RNA sequence: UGUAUAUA
């Protein structure tokens, strides 16, 4: 009749008016794994202002932790006790699940409990959770679920305590490549770039530079490179802008690497933009200047447009004096009218 | 005219 109870309450939730948490004492597991009972627990926890009601079920939560954390409805019940305002309970709760954290990190509901704990609890408990992640970190970083736990770790824990995550990006020669071209691993790389110290990220970026071409034009790798441009050193931007400038047409005409140039133009210094415009207007002795060839391309026309929006009036004037002759012919090409229309603002001198 | 992340 525990089951009949929850049938009663799915029928007449009016009969849940006068019902409090301490009353389901003993039936917590059935309630928390039920859609209606889980909502009752959650709502009661959020509206009760009686600490002793909430404490009365806590021992049942701690005892059934392992069965609630990867349950479709139970995982919410567990997360409610990782709230700000239940801090007396964080340690007991972390202890109920610590030994199975290497499994929970891969599971689609329990990994939400781990992300909540990392969001709310204090640094020693965070580190205690991370200590278990160490055991599975490489598989975890590439997992659809585990990578969110790792990303959350990186946002919420001080840089020094995720050195082992950086050390995992640098495990082997090709690990940074393998992660950058992986749909989940690449988010971990990006989180590291945004939040680790420059001493931590320097060997990461250096690994990225070694296979820069391949990562830049990868559907996930290009966002890794974009993050390097934004969070890397001035010497990284110089190395990157020097490379794209030397190969401006090749990077500009590929689907993924063309976003890399756009990022250089948005983050780059006047000196950086000058290299890119300078490469774009180079009078290649027997062919059209590559800024005109770029405007004929399916991806690179978005790049030329980014130059006009991002460079200095002086530099823009070099673009205009280079592109003005070819405007007849450019209107012919696919979308050439739309491409030049969006540029009309600049050619009405 | 061109790109990405797990719950009722
Ligand atoms: Cl290497």
Automatic annotation (TrEMBL):
- Where does the PUM-HD domain lie? 1-347
Q: Does the keyword Cell cycle apply?
A: no
Main localisation? cytoplasm
Q: What GO annotations for molecular function exist for this entry?
A: mRNA 3'-UTR binding
Where is the protein situated, by its record's location annotation? Answer: Cytoplasm
- Keyword RNA-binding on entry: yes
The record's Gene Ontology cellular component field reads: cytoplasm; nuclear periphery; nucleus; P granule
An example GO biological process term is: cell differentiation
Q: Which domain of life is it from?
A: Eukaryota
Q: Which UniProt keywords apply?
A: Cytoplasm, Developmental protein, Differentiation, Repeat, RNA-binding
Query: Where would you find the membrane-spanning parts of this chain?
Result: none
Q: Where are the Pumilio repeats?
A: 23-59, 60-95, 96-131, 132-167, 168-206, 207-242, 243-278, 285-322
Protein's name according to its UniProt entry: PUM-HD domain-containing protein
Q: What is the lineage of its organism?
A: Eukaryota, Metazoa, Ecdysozoa, Nematoda, Chromadorea
Note the residue range shown relative to the complete protein: 172 to 520 of 535
């Amino acid at each position: 009749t525990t089951d009949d109870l929850l049938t009663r309450y799915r029928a007449n939730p009016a009969m849940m008016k006068n019902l409090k948490l301490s009353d389901i004492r003993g039936a917590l597991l059935k309630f928390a794994k039920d859609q209606v009972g889980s909502r009752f627990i959650q709502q009661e926890l959020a509206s009760s202002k009686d600490r002793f009601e909430k404490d009365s079920i806590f021992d049942e939560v701690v005892s059934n932790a392992d069965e609630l954390v990867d349950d479709i409805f139970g995982n919410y019940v567990v997360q409610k006790f990782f709230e700000y305002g239940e801090e007396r309970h964080w340690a007991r709760l972390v202890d109920a699940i610590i030994d199975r954290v290497p499994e929970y990190a891969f599971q689609m509901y329990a990994c939400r409990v781990l992300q909540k704990a990392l969001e709310k609890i204090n640094e020693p408990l965070q580190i205690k959770i991370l200590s278990q992640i160490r055991h599975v970190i490489h598989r975890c970083m590439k997992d659809q679920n585990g990578c969110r736990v790792v990303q959350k770790a990186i946002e919420k824990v001080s840089p020094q305590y995720v050195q082992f995550i950086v050390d995992t990006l640098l495990e082997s020669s090709n690990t940074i490549y393998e992660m950058s071209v992986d749909p989940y691993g690449c988010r971990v790389v990006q989180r590291c770039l945004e939040h680790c110290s420059p001493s931590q990220t320097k060997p990461v970026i250096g690994q990225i530079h070694k296979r820069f071409d391949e990562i830049a034009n990868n559907q996930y790798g290009n966002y890794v490179v974009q993050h390097v441009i934004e969070h890397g050193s001035e010497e990284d931007r110089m190395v990157i802008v020097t490379r794209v400038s030397n190969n401006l047409f090749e990077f500009a005409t590929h689907k993924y690497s063309s976003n890399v140039i756009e990022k250089c133009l948005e983050q780059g210094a006047v000196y950086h933009k000058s290299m890119i415009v300078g490469a774009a207007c180079h009078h290649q002795e027997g062919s059209v200047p590559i800024v005109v060839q770029m405007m004929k391309d399916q991806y690179a026309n978005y790049v030329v447009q980014k130059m006009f929006d991002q460079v200095t009036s002086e530099q823009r004037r070099e673009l205009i004096l280079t592109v003005r002759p070819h405007i007849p012919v450019l209107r012919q090409f696919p979308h050439g009218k739309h491409i030049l229309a969006k540029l009309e603002k600049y050619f009405q001198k």
